[PDB]
Amino acid sequence: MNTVPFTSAPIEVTIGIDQYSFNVKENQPFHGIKDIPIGHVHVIHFQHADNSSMRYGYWFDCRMGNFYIQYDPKDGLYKMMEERDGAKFENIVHNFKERQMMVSYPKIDEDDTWYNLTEFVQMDKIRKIVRKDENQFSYVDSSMTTVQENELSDPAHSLNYTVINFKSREAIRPGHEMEDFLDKSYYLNTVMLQGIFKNSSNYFGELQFAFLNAMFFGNYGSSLQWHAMIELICSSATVPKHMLDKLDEILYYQIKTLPEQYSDILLNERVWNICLYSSFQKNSLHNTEKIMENKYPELL
Amino acid sequence: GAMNSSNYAELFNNDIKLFVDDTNVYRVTVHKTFEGNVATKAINGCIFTLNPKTGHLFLKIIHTSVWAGQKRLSQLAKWKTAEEVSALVRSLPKEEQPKQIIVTRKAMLDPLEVHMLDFPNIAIRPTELRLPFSAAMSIDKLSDVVMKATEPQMVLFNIYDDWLDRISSYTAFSRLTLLLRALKTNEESAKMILLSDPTITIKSYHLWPSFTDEQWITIESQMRDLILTEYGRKYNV
Numbered sequence: 001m002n003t004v005p006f007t008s009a010p011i012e013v014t015i016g017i018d019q020y021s022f023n024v025k026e027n028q029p030f031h032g033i034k035d036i037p038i039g040h041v042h043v044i045h046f047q048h049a050d051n052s053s054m055r056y057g058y059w060f061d062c063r064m065g066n067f068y069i070q071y072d073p074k075d076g077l078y079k080m081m082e083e084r085d086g087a088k089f090e091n092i093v094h095n096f097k098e099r100q101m102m103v104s105y106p107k108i109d110e111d112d113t114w115y116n117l118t119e120f121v122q123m124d125k126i127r128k129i130v131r132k133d134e135n136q137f138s139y140v141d142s143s144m145t146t147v148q149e150n151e152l153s154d155p156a157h158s159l160n161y162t163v164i165n166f167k168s169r170e171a172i173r174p175g176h177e178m179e180d181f182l183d184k185s186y187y188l189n190t191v192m193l194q195g196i197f198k199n200s201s202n203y204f205g206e207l208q209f210a211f212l213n214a215m216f217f218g219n220y221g222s223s224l225q226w227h228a229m230i231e232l233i234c235s236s237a238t239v240p241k242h243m244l245d246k247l248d249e250i251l252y253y254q255i256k257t258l259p260e261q262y263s264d265i266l267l268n269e270r271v272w273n274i275c276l277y278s279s280f281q282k283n284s285l286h287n288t289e290k291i292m293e294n295k296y297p298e299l300l
Numbered sequence: 301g302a303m304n305s306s307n308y309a310e311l312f313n314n315d316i317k318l319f320v321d322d323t324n325v326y327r328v329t330v331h332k333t334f335e336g337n338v339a340t341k342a343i344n345g346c347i348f349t350l351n352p353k354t355g356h357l358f359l360k361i362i363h364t365s366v367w368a369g370q371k372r373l374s375q376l377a378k379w380k381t382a383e384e385v386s387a388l389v390r391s392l393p394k395e396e397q398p399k400q401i402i403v404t405r406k407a408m409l410d411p412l413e414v415h416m417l418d419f420p421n422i423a424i425r426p427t428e429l430r431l432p433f434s435a436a437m438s439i440d441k442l443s444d445v446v447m448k449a450t451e452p453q454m455v456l457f458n459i460y461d462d463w464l465d466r467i468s469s470y471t472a473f474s475r476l477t478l479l480l481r482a483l484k485t486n487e488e489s490a491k492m493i494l495l496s497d498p499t500i501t502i503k504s505y506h507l508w509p510s511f512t513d514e515q516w517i518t519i520e521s522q523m524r525d526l527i528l529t530e531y532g533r534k535y536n537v
């Protein structure tokens with residue numbers, strides 16, 4: 001069970017750790033988060049009390065280093081940092097645990113939610129989508145645009161998701177125009193799975209990462225990416241059976257975790273109605289269709 | 301974006317463009333079977349591809365054999381249309397290829413866009429104009445070449461005959477759409493207006509009769525009367 005300690009909390013902030021959140025008051029004696037489960041990526045995220053504008057946060061994996069959060073009064077945000085001195089980090093963290101100045105990662109034993117949301121998400125792939133090679137952790141915020149959004153502007157601060165575009169020469173074989181547009185199996189299986197992602201686990205990892213950035217930061221291009229990656233599968237007539245079954249599980253937990261009050265902005269009516277009721281896979285997503293119909297029947 | 305009354309003179313500028321109408325590509329007669337069920341029988345069709353500035357009509361004849369053994373023919377028809385337009389464009393010298401293609405039905409946008417991905421600088425556009433190009437098969441010489449075809453074939457016409465010698469392409473298009481609207485609203489009457497006079501003929505190399513300027517004014521008036529009439533005969537007014 002690892003620990004993300006804090007130098008201090010100088011400004012009032014709502015802090016998120018994965019699907020949990022808590023409020024910290026200005027100059028409150030808060031020194032971090034303990035009992036963080038090993039084996040999963042995590043995200044620690046922030047919304048200042050005085051400017052709800054810009055949610056922002058850091059994806060990390062405690063197996064890759066000792067990380068601490070320190071507020072910067074010049075740039076005006078909580079920054080993640082790496083401590084190279086393992087023995088300083090251990091001594092400082094032990095002090096905070098003894099003075100009980102840390103919140104405990106509050107996982108219910110029954111509860112597989114975070115695993116189910118991050119099953120295929122790997123730090124190494126996050127770091128290829130979010131390019132800042134000098135750090136082991138990755139910063140994301142509400143405003144960051146995607147490479148495809150930029151094609152339609154600062155490339156260093158972009159989300160380099162895999163570009164998906166249904167009316168593109170990559171997606172459409174010369175001479176198969178109607179076939180490939182109406183049945184995207186070629187584009188899914190040959191171009192994307194065999195060619196770009198290599199396997200469905202890497203495809204699902206990017207889909208899950210895109211959803212989580214949409215949910216936690218309201219990142220609009222991330223939401224576009226999540227929906228494109230769903231729609232590409234649903235619009236393929238030929239999809240491996242294991243992929244369909246896993247997609248249903250992935251989406252089910254995503255829809256389950258989505259705040260009820262953000263569904264209007266985080267779910268695209270067209271895509272979901274097409275996927276659940278018109279597409280090749282309209283009958284392949286039983287769990288997802290059932291929770292959607294019971295939780296958001298208005299969207300449908 | 302879309303083409304409407306606000307940007308109508310754009311049709312007659314010097315940017316090459318083509319209207320594409322697919323409403324006569326897939327044509328059927330519906331009939332009863334010996335068992336009292338219903339069935340369709342396809343008949344020859346055509347793509348109506350028209351340069352509004354020059355009058356040049358690229359009439360691609362769609363022979364019924366293209367449908368043999370196919371499913372979802374109404375969907376296939378839009379894609380076949382787009383395949384044939386894309387083939388036409390690629391067959392033209394670069395300096396003759398259109399800068400824009402305007403489809404008369406929005407369902408042609410995605411099929412055409414996908415077939416023209418190789419041509420990112422050709423704009424594919426819809427229109428809000430309700431153009432009467434479906435009535436092209438009421439022009440006797442066009443209907444004749446379509447019904448006589450025994451194989452796929454492209455035939456080239458000038459739908460303006462020789463009018464551009466005397467009038468502008470804006471006026472020629474306005475005449476064409478008036479004639480076609482009339483043929484669409486009441487074909488028998490429209491045809492009587494056009495052809496009930498034997499002293500005014502159709503030249504072998506033309507589609508419409510050889511009216512003088514004055515006779516066109518008379519003809520054009522008679523067509524407006526027809527359209528307004530039928531609009532009363534229709535709505536009772």
Ligand SMILES: CS(=O)(=O)Nc1ccccc1F
Pocket residue numbers: 005006007068070083088089092
């Ligand atoms: C004590 S320090 O501020 O210089 N470095 C530090 C390291 C680890 C956790 C917190 C920290 F503040």
